[PDB]
Symmetry: C7
Subunit: 277 residues, 7 copies
């Protein structure tokens, strides 16, 4: 019915048997082998009893999980029970133990991925690299964290599909956390159709001025830049860039578009025109 | 005929032999080695009997599977039977045990893929990453789940061919579940042939308005966007995007086409024309 | 001459020697070491006899295979015979056993590919992923199965060359079976030179109608689609697709060509013309 | 309450039990097995006591970390306690020890990544390859170091997102330290539309002169170069380059732009014009 | 001088020593250790004698191979001789045996490639994937087999250079045998400049007729095909293909050219012209 | 204070204890276990003393390195001290030894990279592949050697940044030494716009003559070449090349430019003009 | 001074000590442990003496190599000496042996590359794949062999830089030997601007005739070919090829240029002109 009975039946059987053997030998002397064999067989029987009542108990309340557990647990204890009494009796100890050992690391290397996922899940619960809702990018996958488990994490990628990442990928690869950034950084390239480069400096400086007198820019770490990155026949390329304050994602788009339009306005104000890549 | 006879013949032979040896020694004292050898040889014979009857029993009802099982099982017990009585007799114990051990992990590393498939099949029956009929994408393969087994899953890919994926690929790679998405997300790029960028803001805003007053859009998480992503000589590129409600797959196509046509309509309404990439 | 003599010579020699030793000790007491050494050396001699007669017997009936087997078997039993009597005599047991053990897993890791091929061949005879004549695609190779063995499969690829695939590639990679498909799926893209997109809907719908009133289409799972996938200056791209009934391979080509011609006919009927990618 | 009680309860119980057993045997002789079993069980109980009070003590002051530690520590000592008394009692020693050993290296190979991160963190604290604030580039990631830990380093990449690099990537890959450079090096390519190559030498030499009479160049290691790298129909390509003094990052941009403009000025002074790639 | 003397000197020394020790102990009792030490040292000396005589014998007839063999064999027996008498004497048995064991698998993993080549050479002599003169393609290499060895195969590639392929590449990769094909297969694509697609069917059918009334085609498995694979503005693409009978390599070229010219003739007969990709 | 005291305190304690035990047993006989336990515990205490004195001594003179060493050394000896007295006392020997062994190779495989770096550093100090100042190229990295250590080498790459290469990359990859070359080799391709190929031979020969009558060419190994590599409509491509004497890096550029200009001069002298790729 | 003294001091000390102990026990009986400890410590001292004398002897004649050897040898014998007397004394045998064993395979896997290089160097001295001066191509590297060692080979690549290839790359990759070819093979493609393909056969045949009546062609294996590989609007592509006799490298260039010019001559003789790819 419970653990109490599952113990008190084998315990009483074992005490009965050893008390029998004691007065079977006192009034040919293999008390130790028989007693050890009885102890081994009795608790093999006891955990069989305990296993059955446990997986009968939660079947008395996620169902195929329970018999998957039942069958896996039955195989496991069949294995150990066979090993243990083969060792208690003394018949073919090293042979059966060698078979069991090679089966064990067969299973132990075949299960390196499940174990990797579990151990990496624990390591992640220690050093939290992200939390629920953060937009992360792990190697090839990218999205919003929607579920954190022990063997897998669940993301929502750019097409708004739920992705399932095994947790052993967060220990061998870098993780980008797009939700902990304190300032953003934009950079673009504008092509110019220009032959009188004598006004590339002026334009450049003016654009930088525009980027410094613009709200939503961050002048704390790096200054806005706009330099000539390559030149060609009636062609030039300006590389613009700056840092922006911590903003949302529609405001980032609006700021990018606004900076681009103001830069093109400054460019066309000096009589220059855009080029063609 | 059954397990009963397959046990009662070797058991009676063994009891006969040990009872013979007892009065062969009472009225030179190697009772233990001979008794252990008899026990080992008798149950080697007993499982041979049990194996033969079991694979004769289901041959008396998927046939080449049965003798594949028969031959594999015969090799396995030949191996263990040889190890066990070489150990019971005492002749060349460590030599034969070392040979058997190196053969065992030869086989145990050669079989890492079959074991990986089986263990990953079990791990998947615990943490269900998909179910029958879901459209998944695992690494390089993509399709509808049509069969779930213990060592392989079966998909139906985009050309409507049945693919057979070994289950050890669902533990080391990410799984995209295209059937559990609750809202979709579309994004496109429209090129414009425009020289007066002074009307890029207006157009943009109007398009966003259109995307918000459109049924089948989802205004719960992110707002529709339409920003200028790059500019060029009489050329510009608008990046449009939005989220859509949970819809089928022909309605997704219809909505994409409709959004694209309405956007081009708004663009041409402002006197702008499409560009050429 | 046979197994009978190959056993009855060493067996009689061994019985003679042990009977000699018994009355050599009865009328200095190392009966066990000498008897075990005699047993080990006698059956080493017996399997040497058995090996020679077996590979002389099938040489008395695929010939270089036989002496390859002869030499490999001679090396193997030289190894085990050396290990076993070094252990029976008692001279340098652990040294020679360690040498033999490191040689054994040297050989056991060097032979991981042959063992992988054999074990995967067996695993495939259990879970049949294809049969003789099927057109499969395994990773990088594609063709018709023309031979199925235990360590290799033989295909006939697209240039009609016989390919030889090691069977360990069918356990780590996905297998596409192009001969078990129950319906096909075609998809194409048509470019249009169009400036009045006001007739992209009509055209689209008409094409879909054509794809539904066409025999050899399969309306069981997905409906035919034809949507606008991208637009450009006097340019548009229609993505067409449908499912087809289970048909041959020349009928698939004919149906593709027919669908394409009918679609272009519908397109040109509305005054539109094809574009240029 | 503390370590003192957690030791003095099991120590007094053990001393009581051994003193009982001594006069239980003096006035059947298995003093050693029972005493060793008592010692093993007593300190198993003692560290259980010590573990509970330690993880109750820092729960009496970063909380889910504490019970993660509690559960992991409970599993670990359950394992060792089971192994140790199975060995003290003598029941199924080698079987349980083999099970524990295969579980141990299952866990020891599954945890190769966490251990790699920790050991590489230590190795890095010995041979410091960078310090806080340096701009490094490790394999595929690049940014400013913002945090140095034992299992992970934290960078700030080019988009100003915090990246989390596992420390086992700094032992197998090269590390570029962009903050310890003592002089910079710029190089560019200018295309020329020229048919009279008789003035390619002159131009070249003049440009080099310009690069040597420019402040912010470093004439310590290599001389400025400007050579003809390939020629074509009315086309040529000059490859320019030089070293610059240790400067900031906006001054590097300004110097690049200035050198490029001066070079194009020299080129157009000789009646040559820029070409088109 | 020979094996006879190389045995009869150590054998007589050993018999002399054991006969001395017997009457040294009969008229302090460590007969077994000294006798085992003498046996070990004597045959260590005997194989040293045998090794020297053998590699002096074939030096008395490919010379640097002989002393490479001499030095390697001297190192090997120095190793085993040291292990064996350290074990015979009894001084530091487990220490020296552990050193020797870690050296052994250091060497046994360092030599995985040579062993792989040898074992794969044997596996190939069993399942012959090609023979001398066949034109094979193994992974990245392609050519005519000009030599088959035990650790390497020799090919003659397309530039007519001798390539040396390690035999461990024929067990992990697919092998294409271009000399066992029984029929060939050609396929080409012809672009058409056509606006009246109403004659794409006719042309197609006519071409197929041509491919069936052509000798050197194989109508046993698949029928000749010619279908429209994609269409464009005044552009179309016909995909032609057929099977050819088993022919040489200049006849294959001639047949390809002939089929192509006849197809273009049929195309231009219907007033169509070739297009431009 | 020093090693002398750190030894003479535990040595005197141990001698005192063994002298006590001797007359505690002479006037119950477990002299060996207690004496071995005392010896083990005493030198565990002695190296603890020695370790503390050593890492206190160099803290009395690169500081965080010292306590990193202190903590690592404390963990290591805690481990060995626990193993050694668990083995001396006799309580749970095999259990604790198995735990320690699986921890040991966990650490021994986790530290394969640090050990690889150290061993490869030693191997490099034996077979010197480069020296300080040489310009090497190892796999993906290239630059001037500026520091050679035991676990890492330091380079200065093309952008003049200090790179840090782990020394285990110089044992698995090829190393190009650009500072030990004794002659250089240049090669270029010139396109020609030519329709009368009847003067391709002449031009070619003339160019080769020019390359042989040029100082700074090396006529020791290979002769200068200039051949027609491919032809096209009013287009041809000459492939030129030669060897140059051992020269600097600005002289190499000057020689390349000079050879190119002289070749174009010869080409235009024959009425030919350059083509357009 | 030499090996004689380095042996005769420890040998005389050991004989003195054992002779002392014999009459210390004859007139408490631990002769075996003390004698074995003395033997172990004495030869530990003897090889220390021998090591110092040897690396002092070649320091009395490539110097940093000598102390690198000295320190490595001192560490190694410190290790073995510690293991051996810990085993001779009997204090913490299995603990120290386990530590030494895990250190040993840590070192034995960390040194897999050096051992791979050495073993592959030996394997190459057996099966010589090239010799000094041959032009080989191993995987990604190509050049003339200028030095052959035991752990590395030295090449001279196409830029005439000395490359250093680890010898473990010649056992896992294919080796192309460009110096053992007995005939060469050239192949080119000529584009034609042709609309009347009725003269593609004639031209083709004529070209083949030219290739057969040309000296320096090899008509032993394959015949010269020239076939139409693809056609297009006023465009065609002829694929030409043949085998050439064994010639140098400037004669190969001359023959290529000559064949190309003669082919273009034949082409233009038939009124055809070259096309434009």
């Amino acid at each position: 019915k419970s653990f109490w009975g599952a113990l008190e039946d084998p315990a009483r059987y074992l005490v009965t048997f050893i008390a029998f053997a004691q007065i079977a030998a006192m009034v040919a002397q293999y008390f130790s082998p028989t007693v050890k064999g009885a102890v081994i067989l009795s608790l093999v029987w006891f955990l069989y009893r305990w296993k059955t009542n446990v997986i009968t108990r939660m079947l008395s309340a996620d169902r195929e999980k329970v018999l998957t557990l039942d069958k896996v647990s039955s195989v496991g204890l069949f294995a150990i029970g066979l090993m243990a009494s083969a060792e208690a009796c003394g018949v073919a100890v090293q042979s059966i133990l060698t078979v069991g050992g090679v089966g064990g690391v067969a299973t132990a290397f075949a299960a390196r991925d499940i174990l990797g996922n579990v151990l990496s899940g624990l390591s992640m619960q220690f050093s939290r690299p992200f939390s629920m809702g953060d937009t992360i990018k792990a190697g090839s996958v990218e999205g919003q964290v929607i579920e954190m488990g022990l063997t897998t994490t669940s993301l929502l990628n750019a097409e708004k599909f739920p992705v399932l990442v095994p947790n052993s990928l967060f220990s061998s690869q870098v993780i980008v956390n797009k939700s902990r950034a304190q300032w953003r950084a934009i950079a673009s390239k504008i092509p110019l159709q220009i032959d009188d480069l004598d006004m590339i400096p002026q334009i450049s400086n003016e654009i930088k001025e525009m980027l410094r007198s613009n709200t939503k820019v961050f002048l704390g770490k790096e200054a806005p830049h706009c330099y000539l990155s390559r030149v060609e026949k009636s062609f030039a390329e300006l590389t613009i860039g700056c840092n922006l304050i911590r903003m949302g994602k529609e405001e980032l788009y609006n700021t990018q578009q606004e900076v681009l339009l103001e830069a093109v306005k400054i460019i066309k104000k000096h009589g220059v025109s855009l080029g063609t890549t």
